[PDB]
Enzyme design. Structure first.
Site, mmCIF file in Angstrom:
data_model
loop_
_atom_site.group_PDB
_atom_site.id
_atom_site.type_symbol
_atom_site.label_atom_id
_atom_site.label_comp_id
_atom_site.label_asym_id
_atom_site.label_seq_id
_atom_site.Cartn_x
_atom_site.Cartn_y
_atom_site.Cartn_z
ATOM 1 N N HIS A 142 0.831 -1.220 0.000
ATOM 2 C CA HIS A 142 0.000 0.000 0.000
ATOM 3 C C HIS A 142 0.863 1.266 0.000
ATOM 4 O O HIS A 142 0.565 2.213 -0.735
ATOM 5 C CB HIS A 142 -0.943 0.005 1.226
ATOM 6 C CG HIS A 142 -1.530 1.351 1.565
ATOM 7 N ND1 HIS A 142 -2.553 1.928 0.845
ATOM 8 C CD2 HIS A 142 -1.235 2.231 2.557
ATOM 9 C CE1 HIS A 142 -2.854 3.105 1.364
ATOM 10 N NE2 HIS A 142 -2.069 3.314 2.404
ATOM 11 N N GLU A 185 -5.710 9.702 0.933
ATOM 12 C CA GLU A 185 -5.980 8.260 0.984
ATOM 13 C C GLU A 185 -7.085 7.793 0.006
ATOM 14 O O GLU A 185 -6.933 6.737 -0.601
ATOM 15 C CB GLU A 185 -6.304 7.811 2.411
ATOM 16 C CG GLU A 185 -5.161 8.016 3.439
ATOM 17 C CD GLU A 185 -4.005 7.025 3.302
ATOM 18 O OE1 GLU A 185 -4.057 6.073 2.479
ATOM 19 O OE2 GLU A 185 -3.023 7.184 4.042
HETATM 20 O O1 LIG Z 1 -0.582 5.916 11.987
HETATM 21 C C1 LIG Z 1 -1.512 6.548 11.480
HETATM 22 N N1 LIG Z 1 -2.222 7.359 12.312
HETATM 23 C C2 LIG Z 1 -3.263 8.101 11.797
HETATM 24 O O2 LIG Z 1 -3.883 8.816 12.571
HETATM 25 N N2 LIG Z 1 -3.581 8.029 10.501
HETATM 26 C C3 LIG Z 1 -4.729 8.845 9.976
HETATM 27 C C4 LIG Z 1 -4.528 9.618 8.672
HETATM 28 C C5 LIG Z 1 -4.494 10.377 9.982
HETATM 29 C C6 LIG Z 1 -2.868 7.207 9.708
HETATM 30 N N3 LIG Z 1 -2.992 6.943 8.408
HETATM 31 C C7 LIG Z 1 -2.057 6.067 8.094
HETATM 32 C C8 LIG Z 1 -1.856 5.526 6.681
HETATM 33 C C9 LIG Z 1 -3.121 4.841 6.139
HETATM 34 N N4 LIG Z 1 -3.293 4.469 4.866
HETATM 35 C C10 LIG Z 1 -4.501 3.912 4.779
HETATM 36 C C11 LIG Z 1 -5.146 3.384 3.727
HETATM 37 C C12 LIG Z 1 -6.424 2.844 3.862
HETATM 38 C C13 LIG Z 1 -6.994 2.873 5.135
HETATM 39 C C14 LIG Z 1 -6.283 3.439 6.198
HETATM 40 C C15 LIG Z 1 -5.056 3.932 6.004
HETATM 41 N N5 LIG Z 1 -4.197 4.509 6.847
HETATM 42 N N6 LIG Z 1 -1.342 5.760 9.169
HETATM 43 C C16 LIG Z 1 -0.178 4.810 9.194
HETATM 44 C C17 LIG Z 1 -0.525 3.568 9.742
HETATM 45 C C18 LIG Z 1 0.479 2.611 9.953
HETATM 46 C C19 LIG Z 1 0.173 1.366 10.502
HETATM 47 C C20 LIG Z 1 -1.146 1.069 10.839
HETATM 48 C C21 LIG Z 1 -2.145 2.024 10.632
HETATM 49 C C22 LIG Z 1 -1.841 3.270 10.084
HETATM 50 C C23 LIG Z 1 -1.846 6.480 10.188
HETATM 51 FE FE LIG Z 2 -2.178 5.147 3.330
#
Ligand SMILES: O=c1[nH]c(=O)n(C2CC2)c2nc(Cc3nc4ccccc4[nH]3)n(Cc3ccccc3)c12
Ligand SMILES: [Fe+3]
Length: 285
Positions: A163, A208
């Site tokens: 991803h 996203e």
């Molecule tokens: O750590 C994050 N904290 C957050 O608060 N947000 C939200 C945007 C403010 C995040 N977003 C993404 C990346 C991400 N790419 C996605 C694609 C599809 C669904 C969820 C996704 N989160 N990450 C990185 C991440 C890494 C490992 C597991 C979950 C998420 C985060």
């Molecule tokens: Fe992402």
């Protein structure tokens, strides 16, 4: 008063470490268990200034990547925005994007650094919205290094490296997109809890799951779409609800995770999405 926030790129050392389940495919897998621990440890012990540890991916991991990579690449010419399509072959040439090779985060980070000043930092797992968005202020993308379980190449309950590399990286190589992204991070720095959630939601329905209109046609630039074969097709299928990207309206929309989105937002261009966010951040500062 104002909560702690990073003031320089190395300050992310202090928040990037602030991070499986039984329903997950692979919970059952002891080898996958140890592997994920290995990836998490690499991220935990990374400090800014370090080369990102190069990983010898297994044949099973490369096969999984290849399977996702092959199918997604059949769809990009007809689905992805022009900027995505422009940068993807450059990554193929300079970072070893191939069906039979998983690119190294260090190479990808060096490629992006010279293109837009963006860089990669491996992250062990999910960060708070605040910490995750704060990286973008220094053009740092917090990036997972692990691979989804080989049992189901086409679904991941979480962002995996596939991803990150196929969905996020090609646009981070694009100046206009990188400016847009960094400005989200900058707006978040030391902002209120409410503002952070609003910015996080805008990020969600752009970076996203964003769509854009190019030459009268709807195209995809959202990373979550670009690494998801099903929803990529669904998003431009015509059976999806679509609205104009408008921060004050978009920041109220619920971010769905275990399902297709209820609605997708369309930006006119990255420049325009940027201009709208600027106008919007004024009303939440
Ligand atoms: O750590 C994050 N904290 C957050 O608060 N947000 C939200 C945007 C403010 C995040 N977003 C993404 C990346 C991400 N790419 C996605 C694609 C599809 C669904 C969820 C996704 N989160 N990450 C990185 C991440 C890494 C490992 C597991 C979950 C998420 C985060
Ligand atoms: Fe992402």
């Amino acid at each position: 008063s104002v909560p702690w926030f990073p003031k320089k790129i190395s300050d992310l050392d202090h928040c990037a470490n602030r991070v499986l389940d039984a329903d997950h495919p692979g919970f059952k897998d002891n080898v996958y268990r140890k592997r994920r621990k290995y990836f998490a440890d690499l991220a935990m012990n990374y400090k800014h200034g370090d080369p990102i540890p190069k990983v010898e991916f297994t044949e099973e991991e490369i096969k999984t990547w290849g399977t996702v990579f092959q199918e997604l690449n059949k769809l990009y010419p007809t689905h992805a925005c022009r900027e995505y399509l422009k940068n993807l072959p450059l990554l193929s040439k300079y970072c070893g994007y191939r069906e039979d090779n998983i690119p190294q985060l260090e190479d990808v980070s060096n490629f992006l650094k010279e293109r837009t000043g963006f860089s990669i930092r491996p992250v062990a797992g999910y960060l708070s919205p605040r910490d995750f968005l704060s990286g973008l202020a220094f053009r740092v993308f917090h990036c997972t290094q692990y691979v989804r379980h080989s049992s189901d190449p086409f679904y991941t309950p979480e962002p995996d490296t596939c991803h990150e590399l196929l969905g996020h990286v090609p646009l981070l190589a694009e100046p206009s997109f990188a400016q847009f992204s960094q400005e989200i991070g900058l707006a978040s720095l030391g902002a209120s809890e409410e503002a952070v959630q609003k910015l996080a939601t805008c990020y969600f329905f752009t970076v996203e799951f964003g769509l854009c209109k190019q030459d009268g046609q709807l195209r995809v630039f959202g990373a979550g779409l670009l690494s998801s074969i099903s929803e990529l097709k669904h998003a431009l299928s015509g059976h999806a609800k679509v609205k104009p990207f408008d921060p004050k309206i978009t920041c109220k929309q619920e971010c769905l995770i275990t399902t297709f989105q209820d609605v997708y937002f369309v930006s006119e261009s990255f420049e325009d999405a940027k201009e709208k966010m600027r106008e919007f951040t004024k009303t939440i500062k």
